[PDB]
Design a protein around this nucleic acid. Structure first.
Length: 255
RNA sequence: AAAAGACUUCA
RNA sequence: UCCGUGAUAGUUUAAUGGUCAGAAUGGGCGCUUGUCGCGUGCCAGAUCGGGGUUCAAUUCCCCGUCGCGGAGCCA
RNA sequence: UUCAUAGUCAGAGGUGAAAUUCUUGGAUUUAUGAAAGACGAACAACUGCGAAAGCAUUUGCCAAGGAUGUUUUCAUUAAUCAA
RNA sequence: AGGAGUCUGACAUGCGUGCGAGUCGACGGGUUCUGAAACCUGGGAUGCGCAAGGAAGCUGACGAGCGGGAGGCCCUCACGGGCCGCACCGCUGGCCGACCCUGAUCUUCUGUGAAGGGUUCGAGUUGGAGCACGCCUGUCGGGACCCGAAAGAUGGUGAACUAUGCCUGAGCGGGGCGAAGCCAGAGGAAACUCUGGUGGAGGCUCGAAGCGAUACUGACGUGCAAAUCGUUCGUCUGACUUGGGUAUAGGGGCGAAAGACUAAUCGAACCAUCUAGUAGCUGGUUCCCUCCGAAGUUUCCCUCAGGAUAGCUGGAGCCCCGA
RNA sequence: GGCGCGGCUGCUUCGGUGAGCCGUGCCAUCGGGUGCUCCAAGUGGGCCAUUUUUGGUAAGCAGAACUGGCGAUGCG
RNA sequence: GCCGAAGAGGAGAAAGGUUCCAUGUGAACGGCACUUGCACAUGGGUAAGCCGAUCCUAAGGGAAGGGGUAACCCCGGCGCGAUCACGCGCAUCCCCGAAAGGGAAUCGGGUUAAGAUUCCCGAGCCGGGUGUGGCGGUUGACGGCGACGUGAAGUCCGGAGACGCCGGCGGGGGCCUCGGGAAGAGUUAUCUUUUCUGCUUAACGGCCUGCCAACCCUGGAAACGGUUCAGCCGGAGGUAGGUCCAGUGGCCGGAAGAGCACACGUCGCGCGGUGUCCGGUGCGCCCCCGGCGGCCCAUGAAAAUCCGGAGGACCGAGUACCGUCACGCCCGGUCGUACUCAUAACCGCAUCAGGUCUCCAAGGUGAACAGCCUCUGGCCAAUGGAACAAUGUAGGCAA
RNA sequence: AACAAAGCAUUGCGAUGGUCCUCGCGGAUGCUGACGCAAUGUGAUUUCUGCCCAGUGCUCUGAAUGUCAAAGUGAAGAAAUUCAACCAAGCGCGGGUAAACGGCGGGAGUAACUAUGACUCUCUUAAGGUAGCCAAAUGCCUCGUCAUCUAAUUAGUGACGCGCAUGAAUGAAUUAACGAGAUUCCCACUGUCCCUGUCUACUAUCCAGCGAAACCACAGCCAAGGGAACGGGCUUGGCGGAAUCAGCGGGGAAAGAAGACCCUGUUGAGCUUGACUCUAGUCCGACUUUGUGAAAUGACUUGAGAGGUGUAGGAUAAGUGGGAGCC
RNA sequence: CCGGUCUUACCGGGCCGAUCCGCGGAAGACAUUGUCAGGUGGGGAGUUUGGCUGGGGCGGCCAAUCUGUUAAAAGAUAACGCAGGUGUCCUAAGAUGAGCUCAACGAGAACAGAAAUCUCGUGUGGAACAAAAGGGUAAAAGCUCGUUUGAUUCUGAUUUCCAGUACGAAUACGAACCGUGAAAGCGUGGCCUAUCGAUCCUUUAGACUUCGGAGUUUGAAGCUAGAGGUGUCAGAAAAGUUACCACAGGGAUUACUGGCUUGUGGCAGCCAAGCGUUCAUAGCGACGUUGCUUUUUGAUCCUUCGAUGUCGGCUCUUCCUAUCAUUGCGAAGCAGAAUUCACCAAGUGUUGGAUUGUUCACCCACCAAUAGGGAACGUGAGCUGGGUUUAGACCGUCGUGAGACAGGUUAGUUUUACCCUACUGAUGACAGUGUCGCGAUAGUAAUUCAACCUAGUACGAGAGGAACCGUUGAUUCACACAAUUGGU
């Protein structure tokens, strides 16, 4: 049989983890007391600070409104075009301006949003990463459902009460340009949850992977491996729909 | 609104 | 050199239950067409070499020539 | 087109002819409703405008340019031009 | 000097001794010496026997010689035969259950049971037995004559070595080359261009501290050293080097993945235990003498480096033909 | 071993025969090289020579047969 | 003669664990001698308010439900006022975790065989904790256009500490250096003299000509002007100029006719001299420090502590209220400190050519490497003797 | 030359993510969000990346038909035991899918000089090797053949060439820079060489002192022969004055290691897989947790009705007691 | 609004002052656990993975069974010994009885050749009997015809199995029961010589037995007998790799050195077809045949697996002769003359380079010629370390894969202080002394070339082109010295 394949090493352990202490703080969207046509939540962006845990920026927002419990703060997710000294509005009668957060119901159809909730008050799930955005296609006055298209193209049915932020996430185009030092890849790995560099399965000797062994390097068996297959076996193309470059489309996806 | 291709050189 | 794996018409290549052998292409003959070709009807194998068993062997054994794959450590 | 809902049967799609495709797990075709994306039919004409490329939903905003008419200014100031 | 047939059980025996169709004694009490033990005794325990068969019902006799050949007698005695007579072996056949067949008398619910035969198996006579301990010898066993491997398993102890991570510090002489783009000078309508020039980017170059470890296939090779020395060679602002504090622990970890690395131990760490593993394999197994004196063949066998069963041997008893 | 007497029996005609059995009498060049029982051993891998072989060019080959020796046998 | 970033200088971390100092020995050690020693024996030495521990918090060791797991084992009111005694307010807890992250305060001279920034002598300061008076002030401060300089419960907001890499200007430091040239030392087969040491003093109470950066100060009013090493800056008002703030291990000057030797000259004391010398060069951008530009698919710790903004209920009469000066005092209650730190004190079985961390990158010529040096300083490794063949190992040169 | 790498592709993932550790809590995912995370293939640039879905892998839809477990459910039935009906995922039935595993052959005849073959055939098993490269770090034959270079070159380089057995992300070709990587040539130079010398140093040697191990059944001459066929010693021959110093290591099958090779042993161990058997994990159906009801559509009591398909018989003799009369 | 107070006042307490009333979301009889069922399931774990055998593989059956030969044996008898069969096929391809007798050849029949068919004559085992071999048999055991069912049940003495060991098989009976047949008899499977499967379980057969108060149904348990898998045939449920390896052993067994052999290899003799114009023997020489060597290859398995260090090379000593050169020779198809073949002969020589790890061999210029063969393929307590031959890696080929190849490639370690012995070299007693000597005996030193004299002679048509001494010098080796030249 074998010594454990790296995929089990994910598992638990100090080596597989991110530097979670290092991450900058929780960036959850403030669950509104109530009302909010301008300023029972008014923010000023004061600063824009990088998030190591995702590599795109946050905007530092204060947020100052009262009560007790009152709760306010802090570093909310940046959208494109957010600047120091711009106003942020968070809630139901917030102005429809980029950087403001409000429930989907309040948003006009055809407006790009980010930090969209799965479930109301979870504060925001979908459209997060750099330069991505969901697109709110349908509402109507929809008591029942607000239809949003996520960046993959899947059309998601969400409760109209789910809040989102208008605009697309900052940092777009990050993906376009090539890393162009091994060392650039290296530090970028250090920050995230990953064991790098990666040795190819074929490169190893048999004990380390299903791919390993053989004088010349090659996968002894067919690469694409079972949904049924157990952990340790399941490597390569897991249960692949198709392979090789030709004749597909993006995901389509029914409701 | 057309199934269907060729066809040696110099005179 | 050892263990595995085949061969059937000019060529590529199906097939059986022991009594029965095919296809496609290529080719041989007509018709298309002014003439070739595209197309259209017609035709034609000692099942590798070899011996044995049987009522009857293309089919069941054994050998061999060739073409294949796969092994051949610790020097 | 997709989604949902209504109803419903043996086709549909497509062409030269067909097949691929789609198809009983109820399609397509049919009605209404939603969201998204694209484009502006009808209008659009031997037609108008920008220096040219080009530019066509109506509608609102900033701001340009060519007509004219004035006889105001420079009173012939100007023209074309490789780089 | 130490260093190998031990220990006792079972099952089978040899040799011996007491009673002998039963024998056989714990445990208690009774009692001395002695922690002992002994003796009397109830007599546990109910073996092996005393007769057997078989799934189970349930059933269940002991008479005979024949031959060889022990020995007595009769005789008659130089010889000698006749008879019985039993050892013991060979040979014969009936019986008692089981199987199968015929079954009387008859009982008359029901079936028992004379006579007789076949058949194999076991049993019974002239082939009548044991028990008990001791002392032997074997077999199997328990570590099983003794030593001798790699192992597998459980639970602990290791990241002071080393791998990777994290935290937080520290280190990199000096020199070379010259990316951003802007000045002047100069051109063009613009676009932007030429030449001088500045500034300095870099898993950049030559190289110090520091890291690494290519070559002599040198020196050493019971060393300075359980991987060292000299000289050579590579890197040296980076995916770099490194101090400390520190994660991740055994088919698990860690690996830029070599089966590399986890305290001199890694294709599965170390410790202790299971454990006196287990070895058809190698080695060894310690006093004298006597009588006789090998096999290296045959069938079976996951069988051919062994078992098994005869074959080859030898002892111990019993008896009196054979080329 | 052979004979006679007497009983019983068999297989194969209500048919012919011996054989078997029992009972009873009669008459007849070697020389212990040897039987039976219990329990135990190494084995349960050989060799060679001679003779006869079969394979193999052969072989200090391989593999049998028949025997004597070595193994386990001194001494000359 | 050798050692030179330490093939052998100084200070230390870990680790050792008394190895240190002294005296006395010499059986064993030291791979040999030994009078010696890091061997043996006996005595002796380490002294902290101001060094460090200590307090904080960082990967994480986690204490704290519930629950798997028998189980081992593993994941995830308190506080404060308040004096008369009593009531009021809130959100994520609490310890360990760096003797090299962060941090309240000390130097100079002297002295011991052995300690020493540790005791002393002089001087200073801190922290923590009760009294005192000078007065600076009083319906909670004047001055300076301004900037800015010279009370107090309930209650919110917060810096410093506190932070990456590259390049790299500026201040100035101790250096290196030169000369005027003291004071005093070398030395001349044969001189000019030069050459050499040497001229040195705190921490810090007080003064500063106080750089850069910010001055959206004021004031001025540039459409081309100012200005850098470079980028730049400006009419959301440039350059002048009237102002500010504002560093330092940094100028001054005091601490300080406090101070031990440096050297010579002296029995001892003393006395003189040096310590109250002058001036400057060399991007040595070195270490400390303040700025700038550039850079990252990569963004560079936290808390303790120090410390103030507010925004204020209450309280301000010959009564009564605060806060730097000064000052007076007490406390200062814990542990550690020796020595080695390595070709002999660590790890490696050894007095092992191995391995093992920080600072001293400013010692002189030459910065191409390497060498040589010197007032630091340190050393001649536990074997010698006499020849010198071949063999061998290091190694030069060969027509 | 291995690994990494930046760059290039497939695939899984809609969040309580899929995936890893874990009985579990929970954690790691991720205090992230498809421009993200995992799982894998290949490996800068540049030009490119052909054909095959038959087998294997995997995936898709399956409201319909042959196979497809258990339970509940029906039949015989005292049980139970035998049988049925229902049927998931899974075989079947069908498709997609090679930058998935991988594959890319076979033999023929033929031109108006011969030569050669543009031209006509199919089969295994899906296809039948395109661009390139090619005497290859892949070529057996083999030092292939030609050329360069050298005197002379199994080397090296260039060209050819049915390639024993090249070839496209099992990546093909190509290629600047880089390199303690592999091979070759030239100049410079030289003691590597002709061919050895002298010289230094420390050893050596000798002296004083200190003072070891390995190893040791064995006395220890040569040439022959013999012998278990590789004798220091038997046998015959031949030689030898001992002892001691220094050396060259010929021999003692010299010491040093119970051969790593190889064979066996009903030995071990790591690894593999479509041997065997199992065990986690995943998918899927059922049972508890568990409470409701629309009806559509299955079923049971009573009660009141339409009627009851064996030969002949108008039609109603399905089959039982009753049975001479009920209004 | 109330209370307290000093009611031109001050304090406390309650209510109202943007509200009455009555944790959030999602989702819900699912899901998630708990449990069970089917499917996938080297992710993990435990395991196995057939012998023989001229080494194990790899091919093969010679792990069961028959035979002619082997086989010397009455019986028993080996080899991967020769030769070849059986693992089926048969209710007629059995049984019996009556009745017939061949295969085949000649002769005869228009057509028919394959021509049967039909006839006659001769016809002894040559035919016929399913099937190997072999042996057997002529009113049959073979043929023909009818009938029949005994290929029935149960039992077995005994032989084979095997000298005593099982299943199997045979060779007979008896008991029961039939047939045919005239019957006597024959008939206990196949002409004969004999043609296969335990053990649990299951299956059924027949009858009977049995399962713990009585009583009654259901099944179970069982005796005796037959059929269902074991061809690894006297009976396992069952694949590989390891070059990462490990262990116990074996020279019981390989590679490998040695030894035996000597087919192979090398060399020779004999004979002499034949060719060389003619001429066997100047030369060349087949077929055939006998040998010698031990230095290639093969064979064997004696020696070592508690260890024999590998190839190639280098250097260093020694040898053989089957002689390449040199000396002396003989013949010639030897006019000179280059030569060609061969005799005696081992003294001395036998080289330097290019490719390749190479040995070998190819090539180049040399040379007088650049011989071959042994000494453990002489030579690792000398060296070297390129190949071979570990662990890393690539390519090609094969394999599902681990991984493999007498397929290629890059990288990849060389321990020891000499006790004995051997020799080189130095010491060194006894004896009446030192020195000078003798010389038994022991080691070997000179080899070869070029050129000149002879001679442009001999010999020769010519072309070309010799000898002996006499002279000079140099290659190679040895000893030695150092004036010179050269090094230091």
């Amino acid at each position: 049989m074998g010594r454990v394949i790296r995929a089990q090493r994910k598992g638990a352990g100090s080596v597989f983890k991110s530097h979670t202490h290092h991450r900058k703080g929780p960036a959850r969207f403030r669950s509104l007391d109530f009302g909010e046509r301008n300023g029972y939540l008014k923010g000023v962006v004061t600063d824009i600070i990088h998030d190591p845990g995702r590599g795109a920026p946050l905007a530092k927002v204060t947020f100052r409104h009262p009560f007790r419990y009152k709760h306010q703060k802090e570093l909310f997710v940046a959208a494109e075009g957010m600047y120091t000294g711009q106003f942020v509005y968070c809630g139901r009668r917030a102005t429809l301006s980029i950087g403001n957060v409000l429930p989907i119901r309040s948003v006009p159809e055809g407006a790009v949003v980010c930090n969209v909730e799965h479930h109301v008050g979870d504060r925001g799930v979908f459209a997060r990463a750099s330069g991505d955005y969901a697109i709110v296609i349908s509402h109507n006055p929809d008591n029942g459902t607000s239809r949003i298209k996520l960046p993959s193209g899947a059309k998601k049915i969400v409760p109209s009460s789910c809040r989102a932020m208008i605009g697309q996430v900052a940092g777009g185009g990050r993906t376009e340009k090539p890393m162009l030092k091994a060392g650039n890849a290296y530090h970028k790995y250090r920050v995230k949850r990953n064991c790098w560099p990666k040795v190819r399965g074929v490169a190893m000797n048999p004990v380390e992977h299903p791919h390993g062994g053989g004088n010349h390097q090659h996968i002894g068996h067919a690469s694409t491996v079972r949904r049924d297959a157990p952990p340790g076996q399941k490597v390569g193309l897991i249960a692949a729909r198709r392979t090789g470059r030709l004749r597909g489309q993006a995901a389509a996806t029914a409701a």
